[PDB]
């Protein structure tokens, strides 16, 4: 993921929060990622995760059951929603 | 709670997902829910929580953090959502 930048600066791709989305609803449904298939629709990147060599970089996917709204939010900035 | 009946049914009622809800955001917050002046917007019931009584009943509030959409969902079926 190191191997993705833009002018230099390291970034998560932006779909990098699909995969942690779609990650995390199969997790909450308690099926494996690989046999759910999903459909994300307007997702909204409102910044850009700066990836940091030799760092560790926490970010929260937070999934509404039955909507399906989710938001990937690293601390309390949002980085994509949809 | 058990005072508040509908033709002979008891109820839950409509604006009682809305403290549900009032509670649970100040409790997110970390202050006091009667220190914190809230607004629900386009609040849905969807159906009707029935009181039992000398019974225990147990709902799920989730309240997103940044944008304030809400759901409270007895078990895995949806009373409001605003």
Chains 1, 2 share one sequence.
């Not at 494996?32 to 999903?38: A, P, T």
């Not at 629709?41 to 039955?66: E, R, Y």
């Amino acid at each position: 993921l190191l191997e993705h930048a833009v002018d230099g600066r390291m970034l998560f791709p932006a779909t990098g929060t699909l995969v942690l989305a779609w990650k995390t609803l199969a997790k909450l449904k308690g099926v494996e990622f690989e046999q759910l298939g999903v459909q994300m629709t307007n997702v909204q990147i409102h910044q850009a995760l700066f990836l940091n060599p030799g760092g560790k970089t926490t970010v929260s996917v937070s999934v509404m059951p039955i909507t399906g709204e989710f938001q990937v939010r690293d601390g309390e900035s949002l980085i994509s929603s949809g």
